[PDB]
């Protein structure tokens, strides 16, 4: 619980310079969790036994000076959304409680090859549906900056674990903003890379055309390091992009003089709180002092992000969650006699309330007579939303704005009011809709709760995003705050 606040970059040099051994590292990580997570509640299944075993292997490799891997000895937490072979993966649902995968997801395969150490699975909204992680069937993760505030969702555990110094790196998933929004609320860095940048094989599906795995870290550099490790074409995922260049750090450090940054007027609309709005405006000035050209633009179809996103994602979800029937795995109802009952009871009992809402919405949107007016219509709106970005990207290198309309809200404050919960996705969904990469870094605090600054880039231009985010991070960050909590 001593290197527990060290960055990935620095923790690696310590291990390489033999200032500490992989086993001591792992010991520190678990002392932290046992001492801190009973309050934060960011982890679900822990993999301590296996973690120590792996750490032993690494000590030997350290001694024999054969420390290979971009993340040798580095601890990692993974959203229980991402399949981990042999380790319970629940998507924080009763439906998958006790589920032990018999295969490995591509990101884990890649992370294990880089010699990172699996510490455990992180809490999330059930089946990744939510914005506060409160729908979790197991426990309610809390915000490290204020234990009464939500950590965001659906990757609340991923952001909280990193913000509370339990691991220097975590993996989350982002379908409508589930990496960026939690990163914003918990004051950390979260990148949802370009759709197609990271394999979806092994990612329990929410919305296939929108889902994307990404890293959360306490700083920009580490984040780029984790991304390089998980990106890449994958034969197991036909939609993974055949883009060879996965170098995201080579541009980190270079200035942004003349960088053309677009500030969409809609990203500072009426739905955006004054403190958030004020914080992003100051951030804009910080960008100008670094030499960037920040100018206002328009992304006219912004207002349609939430509605179309919810129709499309629920529709896809209504089909992607249909495999859960309790017949081959997961929750199987007992008091079921009829086949119709096996399906209906296993699903109504295994799925939480929000999941069922999404399924009802999606099933309806795709049903006869409603298909064109809802689903197809929303698919057309998605085109418009993507068009907004292409027009803006003809003259600007990057887009900036707030990550979320507000700071983290309270536990219990919006969990019983869906439309209010959804509104928090105002500034994140357009990015998934357009298939673009988006990163969030902290740019201030209000009442102690962090505010996120979002940088949206061109497809496969995460390097530029990391370049501008780092520059901004030199001017303002929360690196020295996490340790205080």
């Amino acid at each position: 619980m001593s290197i527990r606040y060290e960055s990935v970059e620095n923790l690696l040099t310590l291990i390489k310079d033999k200032k500490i051994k992989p086993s001591d590292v792992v010991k520190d990580i678990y002392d932290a969790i046992e001492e801190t997570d009973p309050t934060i509640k960011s982890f679900l299944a822990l993999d301590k036994e296996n973690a120590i075993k792996k750490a032993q292997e690494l000590d030997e490799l350290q001694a024999k000076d054969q420390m290979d891997g971009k993340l040798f000895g580095i601890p990692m937490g993974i959203k229980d959304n991402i399949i981990t072979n042999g380790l319970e993966t629940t998507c924080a649902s009763k439906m998958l409680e006790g589920f032990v995968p018999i295969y490995e997801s591509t990101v884990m395969e890649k992370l294990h090859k880089e010699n990172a150490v699996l510490i455990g699975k992180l809490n999330m909204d059930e089946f990744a549906m939510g914005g506060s992680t409160e729908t979790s069937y197991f426990k309610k993760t809390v915000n490290p900056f204020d234990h009464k505030a939500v950590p965001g969702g659906s990757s609340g555990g991923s952001a909280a674990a990193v913000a509370a110094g339990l691991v220097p790196l975590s993996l989350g998933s982002d379908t409508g903003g589930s990496i960026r929004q939690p990163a914003a609320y918990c004051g950390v860095v979260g990148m949802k890379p370009t759709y197609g940048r990271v394999s979806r094989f092994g990612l329990v599906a929410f919305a296939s055309s929108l889902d994307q795995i990404g890293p959360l870290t306490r700083n920009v550099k580490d984040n780029a390091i984790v991304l390089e490790a998980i990106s890449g074409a994958d034969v197991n995922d036909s939609t993974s992009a055949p883009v060879d260049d996965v170098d995201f750090t080579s541009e980190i450090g270079k200035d942004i003089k003349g960088l053309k940054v677009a500030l969409p007027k809609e990203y500072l609309g009426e739905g955006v709180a004054d403190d958030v709005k004020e914080a992003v405006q100051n951030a804009v000035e910080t960008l100008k002092s670094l030499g960037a050209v920040v100018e206002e633009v328009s992304l006219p179809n912004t207002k349609f992000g939430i509605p179309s996103y919810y129709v499309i994602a629920s529709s896809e979800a209504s089909s992607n969650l249909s495999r859960f029937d309790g017949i081959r795995y997961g929750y199987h109802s007992k008091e079921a006699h009829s086949l119709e009952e096996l399906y209906k009871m296993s699903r109504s009992e295994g799925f939480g309330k929000e999941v069922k809402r999404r399924i009802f919405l999606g099933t309806f949107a795709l049903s006869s007579g409603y298909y064109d007016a809802y689903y197809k219509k929303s698919q057309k709106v998605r085109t418009l939303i993507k068009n907004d970005f292409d027009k803006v990207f003809e003259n600007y290198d990057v887009v900036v704005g707030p990550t979320a309309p507000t700071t983290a809200f309270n536990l219990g404050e919006e969990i019983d009011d869906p439309l209010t919960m959804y509104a928090n996705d105002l500034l994140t969904t357009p990015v998934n809709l357009a298939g673009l990469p988006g990163i969030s870094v902290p740019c201030g605090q209000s009442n102690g709760r962090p505010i996120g600054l979002q940088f949206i880039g061109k497809p496969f231009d995460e390097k530029t995003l990391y370049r501008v985010a780092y520059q901004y991070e030199t001017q303002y960050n929360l690196h020295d705050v996490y340790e205080k909590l």
Binding site: F99, T239, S318, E341, F364, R382
Partner: protein, 92 residues
């Protein structure tokens, strides 16, 4: 609108058990949400093509090379009801 009938129709389509009470609750939610969805009417989509895939990527195919399946044991591992190396389900 959103009637108890539609709600029940949807319930059956998504294979979800819905009680004669959660129906009136799912109805209000389904109405509130769908109404909230009608904001898209303001979106000028006339003549615009729908987006099915955000990433232009063509013909990603797999060579027809078979890979032996996993042991029957593995295939049944996570299932609750199994018999004769097969999944056991009611007969309807």
């Amino acid at each position: 609108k959103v009637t108890r009938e539609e709600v029940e129709h949807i319930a059956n389509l998504a294979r979800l058990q819905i009680s004669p009470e959660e129906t009136e609750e799912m109805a209000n939610t389904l109405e509130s949400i769908l109404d909230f969805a009608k904001q898209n009417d303001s979106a000028d989509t006339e003549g615009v093509e729908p987006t099915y895939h955000v990433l232009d990527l063509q013909n990603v195919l797999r060579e027809d090379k078979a890979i032996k399946g996993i042991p029957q044991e593995l295939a049944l591992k996570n299932a609750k009801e199994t018999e004769d190396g097969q999944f056991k389900v009611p007969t309807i």
